[PDB]
Design a protein around this nucleic acid. Structure first.
Lengths: 53, 47, 48
DNA sequence: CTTGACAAAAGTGTTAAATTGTGCTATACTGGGAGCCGTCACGGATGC
DNA sequence: GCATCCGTGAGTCGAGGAAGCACAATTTAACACTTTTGTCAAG
């Protein structure tokens, strides 16, 4: 986030536009408390049998 | 019995949706006014 | 003439012979009512 | 309330079928197969 | 700016519902027996 914020001062609009998009995702993980590595599955949930009868 | 119908409860379709969102690895939780979890499964799914 | 009063309709009417068909859509086959009955497997909602 | 025969009513224990799981074949074999094709809107993202 | 790509969207009820075999390992079935349970008449 600190690096992205520093790049938010770049004169180019594309650079700041890209930095904002990255930092919006970074901010979401920081605020919600989720971990980015949770986007990779180690255990797969299995639906209850009655919902897939 | 000649009585008025009771108050409804949570539909079974919403419970199916919650379990299907959990089957996608998404933690969907119903909370109360104080943000504490509220169990809509009657304790039948709490280990 | 009007069969209820016996008085004529106040204006001449177009009366003739026409070929009319009874179509396959009958209310006997379409009236349906349900209070309770079968329900679905997964959603438990009433069948259709 | 008991009190002793009784009889199924059931359970425990082996045994043998009947079913199920698993390993094994020695000439030489060495890179798949089916789409094929009449829509139009939009974002949004990238190739730069 | 710019094309080119992919992705998402496009009304509602109803009615139509091709190995084969060998053998070992496991399970199921059929006895056998004993051990409850349920009745009985009493007493």
């Amino acid at each position: 986030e600190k690096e992205l914020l520093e790049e938010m001062k770049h004169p180019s609009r594309a650079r700041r536009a890209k930095a904002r998009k990255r930092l919006e995702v970074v901010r979401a993980f920081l605020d919600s408390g989720n971990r980015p590595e949770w986007m990779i599955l180690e255990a797969v949930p299995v639906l209850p049998p009655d919902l897939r009868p | 019995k000649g009585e008025d119908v009771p108050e409804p409860s949570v539909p079974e379709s919403f419970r199916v949706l919650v379990k299907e969102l959990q089957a996608l690895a998404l933690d969907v939780q119903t909370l109360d006014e104080k943000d504490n979890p509220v169990d809509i499964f009657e304790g039948l799914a709490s280990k | 003439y009007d069969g209820r009063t016996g008085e004529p309709i106040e204006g001449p009417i177009v009366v003739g012979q026409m070929f009319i068909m009874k179509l396959y859509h009958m209310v006997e086959d379409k009236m349906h009512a349900r209070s309770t009955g079968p329900y679905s497997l997964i959603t438990q909602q009433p069948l259709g």
